[PDB]
Amino acid sequence: XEDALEX
Amino acid sequence: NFFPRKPKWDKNQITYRIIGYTPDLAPETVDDAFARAFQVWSDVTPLRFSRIYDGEADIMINFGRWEHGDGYPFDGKDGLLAHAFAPGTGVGGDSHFDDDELWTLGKGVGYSLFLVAAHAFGHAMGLEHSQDPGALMAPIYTYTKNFRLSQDDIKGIQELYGASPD
Ligand SMILES: [Ca+2]
Ligand SMILES: [Ca+2]
Ligand SMILES: [Ca+2]
Ligand SMILES: [Ca+2]
Ligand SMILES: [Cl-]
Ligand SMILES: [Zn+2]
Ligand SMILES: [Zn+2]
Numbered sequence: 001x002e003d004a005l006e007x
Numbered sequence: 008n009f010f011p012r013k014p015k016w017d018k019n020q021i022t023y024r025i026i027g028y029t030p031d032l033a034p035e036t037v038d039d040a041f042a043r044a045f046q047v048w049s050d051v052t053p054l055r056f057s058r059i060y061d062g063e064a065d066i067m068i069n070f071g072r073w074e075h076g077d078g079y080p081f082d083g084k085d086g087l088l089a090h091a092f093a094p095g096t097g098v099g100g101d102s103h104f105d106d107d108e109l110w111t112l113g114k115g116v117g118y119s120l121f122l123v124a125a126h127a128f129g130h131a132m133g134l135e136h137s138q139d140p141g142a143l144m145a146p147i148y149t150y151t152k153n154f155r156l157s158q159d160d161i162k163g164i165q166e167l168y169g170a171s172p173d
Binding site: 001002003004005006007 | 010086090127130135
């Protein structure tokens with residue numbers, strides 16, 4: 001799922 | 008294919024540090040798995056990934072479960088296997104592996120640390136999900152015994168960093 005994150 | 012505003016590393020040497028391990032594999036086999044995962048990207052670019060044994064590396068690698076230090080918690084068994092931050096300062100590039108998964112290098116009884124790391128390091132280098140079913144950066148896990156980086160993957164990583172010198 002959300003495995004690529006921004007920051 | 009890229010993150011918003013196309014973040015990438017403005018250098019060819021990327022340091023990494025393995026902060027900690029899983030008990031599921033020997034540490035030297037974990038080190039080797041991470042090395043091999045970086046090599047799939049090294050091999051078709053001018054990038055080199057250097058292990059450091061202290062200090063702040065560009066890619067800080069660690070294992071954890073549920074909330075593990077960055078406010079993007081893991082979720083127990085399956086689902087989130089690993090996550091990486093897009094290139095940048097601070098947590099940028101950092102790659103984390105959910106130790107609620109059973110780590111292995113083969114099929115069926117756990118997840119391949121090699122394959123999961125190669126995909127997550129693609130994110131750490133600036134690649135987003137591919138819609139090419141054969142690409143490593145396609146979103147859905149599979150075990151492959153004969154893993155080959157796809158032309159889609161090579162095309163994305165080279166667009167950011169260029170092709171291998173040799
Ligand atoms: Ca970092
Ligand atoms: Ca935790
Ligand atoms: Ca999980
Ligand atoms: Ca585990
Ligand atoms: Cl933890
Ligand atoms: Zn994390
Ligand atoms: Zn992904």
